[PDB]
Amino acid sequence: NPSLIRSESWQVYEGNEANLLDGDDNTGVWYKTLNGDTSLAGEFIGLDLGKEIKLDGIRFVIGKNGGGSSDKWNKFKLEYSLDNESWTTIKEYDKTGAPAGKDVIEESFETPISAKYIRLTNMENINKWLTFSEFAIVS
Ligand SMILES: [Ca+2]
Ligand code: NA
């Protein structure tokens, strides 16, 4: 079973990090970001898969309902790794002006991608806290 990896400096403001793996879009977490309420480029959240596996896709739900519904990155990338040291990007996203609330980031790979770690990583400083709801893989 995957476990959560995320930037260590974030504070859990509301929710429980187990909510990010419970298979329910409707349960999430609200993180307070330090550095003057700023998520710096390079910060991240995703999954340690435990072992290298072939992924057919991912389904990550960023944001959450209510409090912190707009507390989301605007530019971020999906990337994977075999060793937690070198990363390879799969997709870059620009969600500036996306609707408030949950946003389903879902990708399918025609040819599986072998990964031990897979995560979303901020590409650009943003002066916001952050909410998330779910991280899942398809394999
Ligand atoms: Ca959840
Ligand atoms: Na919502």
Curated annotation (Swiss-Prot):
It comes from Clostridium perfringens (strain 13 / Type A). Putative virulence factor which is likely to act on connective tissue during gas gangrene. It is found in: Secreted. Belongs to the glycosyl hydrolase 84 family. This is Hyaluronoglucosaminidase. Residues 1-139 form the F5/8 type C domain.
